[PDB]
Amino acid sequence: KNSKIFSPFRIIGNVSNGVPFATGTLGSTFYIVTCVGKTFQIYDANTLHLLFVSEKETPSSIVALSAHFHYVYAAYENKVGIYKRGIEEHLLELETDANVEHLCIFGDYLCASTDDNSIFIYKKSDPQDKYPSEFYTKLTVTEIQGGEIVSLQHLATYLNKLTVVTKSNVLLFNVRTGKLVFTSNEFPDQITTAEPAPVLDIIALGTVTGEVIMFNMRKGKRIRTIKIPQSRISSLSFRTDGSSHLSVGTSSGDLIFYDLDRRSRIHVLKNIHRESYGGVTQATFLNGQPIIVTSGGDNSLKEYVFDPSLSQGSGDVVVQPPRYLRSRGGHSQPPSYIAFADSQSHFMLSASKDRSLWSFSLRKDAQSQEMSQRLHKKQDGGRVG
Amino acid sequence: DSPVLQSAYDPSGQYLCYVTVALDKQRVGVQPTQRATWNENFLYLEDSKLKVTCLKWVNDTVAIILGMNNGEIWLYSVLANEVTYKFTTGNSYEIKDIDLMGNQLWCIDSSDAFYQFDLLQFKLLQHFRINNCVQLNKLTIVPAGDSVAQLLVASHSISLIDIEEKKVVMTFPGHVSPVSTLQVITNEFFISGAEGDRFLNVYDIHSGMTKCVLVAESDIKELSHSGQADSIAVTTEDGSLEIFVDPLVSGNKSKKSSKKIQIVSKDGRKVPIYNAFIN
């Protein structure tokens, strides 16, 4: 019910909810757009400052969001919203009642997959405008061709084609002619993630049993396979600064790092996020950079950095493990108590069921800090229990 | 705090099944509630970390179904002393609640999944899960005879569920904490009470409207209702018993307790009541 005293302003203390975030790159800086329920939030990846919050709450939960240069594409219940600086520029209504649940943007094309295994292609009107706006065609992945569409990507230098990753298969569509160019052989277990490698025409597939496949999308073969037993794979990312590392992200909250050149395992960050809230939900390397941004469903967004190697001659074989860098976070459980810290309405104390007392800022979300529980010393000098 | 971890009466209140720890292993025993009609042998859980999360009397070889924390429903006859049959789901998730109607057992999982088993066939009939119900810890079959339509599932927020469509047909404002009792009173009402609050509320299962709120004077542990809705006896955290006599009549929106019973010894030591039964 609408009110006449109080009007809604914001919902503070939220950083992520376990929708896989998008990264975007203006110039040589990076921003990170994470979904918080029905709004997204844009963060400055060099310092994790909140640049933008989307202007209106969407009528349902945002479920798939991507980001090209200036524009952010957020898919909720039926439709895709194209946003610039938070303020919505366009709204693409799909002609279905099915819930749109994946999307990619390449060229003049925005491609949005619904959950009835149909794909909606949208085209720019003239190649100088800013976002794809007009309806072009519809693609369909029927039960003969592949399973449920589990990812939707465009690996580079592929002239108006689309890699559709179904649960068992990898299809490749030509989105101008509406054609199915190539359908791969099947995969013996259900694949959950996909990420295009910076190697030419190679995609990386992550299965529901523990293996990363390195599919070569032009030969139709698989190049190599990496086995992580009893671990469901939820993220894949590639390092692109002259160090060929892969980072896989496991739904028990682990971030495993592999060298692909010398086939070893660099390091494992264990319990990087909570398994109960989804594990590591999206991990991505900022490209050209040794820093990787992870985000989990426990309302937390972290960055990890690789320091340069400690051996001055070898280097490539002595890889220093990733260390922690900045992070933002909030409560992982709904808060149980609330107070205002001062008369200026600047800070507010907030306690949750996940047994943490945060101090959230109403003026600038970087100032939000968890009150520490590190006990003092006993007054007499005896031991504390 | 009480050593009795779980406890429940049979219908008609003639026997009490109770799970207590015995030197790091759970044990399940059955006592007659009146000797004029000891029972020194228990079912022993042989693992130190396997424990009973829920239990339900079946109704005629008499048996208990013990919902464990490894995705199993043990079915344990009490005259003999073995688990007669071990229902299992495909998972290792602890199961939060079970119920049965006739021969049709239903159960909820810590991954918010619904499982259906048949006690006459010893088979997993159905496995599903429904959207926007994600922290489930109680289910209750709404009775409609041998038809086992309309589950009633709680997650701090009760939701009525049609099982033919596997979908939610009503949504009740629950509590601010997880629901700990969720029981059907009449064919149009159900009572619910949460963890760590002293407020039951009776909802109308046909509209969604709360008929009344029942106010204990301490945090409610268990409840029992007489079989014709005429009396509801709840037992609280301070070991007291509170009887609401005829709560479903016109103390208009919220009703206090009519009677309050506590037990003291001859000394002055107050022993606590846990888990009474009313008829």
């Binding site: 002239l159 190697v199 030969k219 | -």
Partner: protein, 445 residues
């Protein structure tokens, strides 16, 4: 070479000079529109010079058994239950609620015993009361509590017979000329043993007793014996139901402690051996299923002030057998001394030598050994001293190496004046001089 050709790129035709990014992939200054396969190859080389080609893609595609098993495994040790015997040098021991925390003790807790079957812990001390606690993890409550006036208790034991395993007696005794026996019935019927049947001069205090099982050896009828340590060298063995003096065994010296070993013989027949130690270090073993006659007399290597002997690894008096076919021969024998030295003998080979050497002599705690108890599996020995604070060690065996991670400097052990092991749960109770039983659970069990 390629697994697909799409036949659309060949007949597409792109412009080049319309945007500045594609303005760089011309090979002439007269090129303005190029073919699609040419254009794809131009920006393929451009992609290759943005992201340079690594060696892992073209290097290789997919005696190496060890390398493969290391590249698949992530943990490298035995997992949970495929161990079945304890790892040395690092325990796994959580702390539970203090067992007598529900009802406090008014004295130092002098003796402590678990029940053989039920989850019951009996504590007792010099405040002449004895308390039974239903133990669990969370809420160790008090079952019952009996205060014997004018009779401070020093040793209290759950006895449970082998015939019907339905008696459940508690035998308790202190510095008195009597010993009480409570018959457990859930008023309380206790009896008093106060007649040495002609032998009162050699038994002036019923403090140090032990309860054990004995077989008639002409019938297969077992009965419990209590064994009283007397003045000269005497052990007076008497019936645990009738109190009749059965036999007596005299060692030569100052009797300091004794223990009971059992060894099976056939189906349903076993033999009881009393193992009694001089103060000086020489040990007698008496066969007492026949008349109480010596079968072996040996000498402890080293050891001059000997306070406590114990056996373990089979059925001791503190890990008792509920059923007569479950009686086992004890493997280990620890002789703990006044300097804190504990010799450890392995009776799988040290029953033959008659000057047997210990498998190890532990020296970790430096004052007088007043408790040493074996865990029921016989994999831990617990040395404990009531002389200084926090003097308790758990030595792993067969390796004969003290666990180095427990107890720490912050374990509230106190001045350890009794210790007890659970027969089933893997669970220590440690009673100190303040009147507190602290409770720990070993997660191997």
């Amino acid at each position: 070479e390629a697994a697909w050709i799409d036949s659309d790129d060949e007949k597409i035709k792109v412009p080049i000079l319309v945007t500045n990014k594609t303005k760089k992939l011309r090979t002439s200054y007269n090129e303005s529109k190029i073919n699609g396969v040419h254009y794809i190859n131009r920006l393929r080389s451009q992609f290759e010079k943005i992201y340079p080609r690594p060696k892992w893609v073209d290097d290789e595609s997919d005696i190496n058994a060890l390398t493969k098993i290391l590249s698949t495994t992530y943990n490298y040790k035995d997992t949970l239950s495929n161990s079945k015997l304890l790892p040395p040098k690092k325990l796994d021991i959580v702390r539970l609620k203090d067992a007598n925390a529900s009802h406090p003790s008014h004295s130092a807790i002098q003796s402590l015993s678990f029940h053989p079957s039920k989850p019951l812990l009996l504590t007792g001390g010099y405040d002449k009361t004895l308390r039974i606690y239903h133990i669990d993890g969370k809420t160790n409550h008090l079952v019952t509590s009996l205060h014997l006036v004018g009779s401070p208790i020093q040793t209290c034991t759950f006895y449970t017979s082998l015939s019907n395993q339905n008696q459940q007696n508690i035998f308790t005794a202190g510095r008195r000329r009597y010993m009480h026996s409570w018959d457990l019935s859930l008023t309380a019927k206790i009896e008093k043993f106060s007649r040495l049947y002609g032998h009162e001069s050699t038994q002036r205090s019923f403090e140090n007793f032990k309860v054990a099982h004995l077989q008639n050896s002409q019938t297969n009828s077992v009965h419990g014996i209590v064994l009283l340590q007397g003045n000269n060298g005497w052990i007076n063995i008497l019936h645990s139901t009738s109190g009749l003096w059965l036999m007596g065994c005299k060692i030569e010296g100052v009797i300091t402690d004794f223990c009971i070993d059992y060894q099976p013989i056939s189906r349903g027949k076993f033999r009881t051996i009393l193992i009694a130690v001089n103060a000086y270090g020489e040990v007698w073993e008496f066969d007492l299923n026949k008349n109480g006659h010596v079968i072996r007399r040996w000498k402890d290597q080293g050891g001059v002030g000997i306070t406590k002997i114990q056996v373990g690894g089979g059925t001791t008096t503190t890990c008792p057998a509920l059923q007569i076919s479950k009686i086992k021969q004890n493997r280990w024998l620890a002789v703990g001394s006044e300097s804190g030295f504990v010799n450890l003998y392995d009776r799988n080979n040290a029953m033959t030598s008659s000057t047997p050497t210990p498998v190890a002599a532990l020296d970790q705690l430096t004052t007088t050994i007043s408790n040493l108890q074996f865990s029921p599996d016989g994999q831990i020995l617990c040395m404990a001293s009531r002389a200084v604070k926090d003097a308790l060690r758990l030595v792993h065996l067969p390796s004969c190496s003290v666990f180095s991670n427990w107890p720490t400097s912050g374990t509230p052990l106190g001045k350890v004046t009794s210790v007890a092991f659970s027969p089933s749960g893997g669970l220590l109770a440690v009673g100190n001089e303040q009147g507190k039983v602290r409770l720990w659970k070993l997660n191997h069990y």
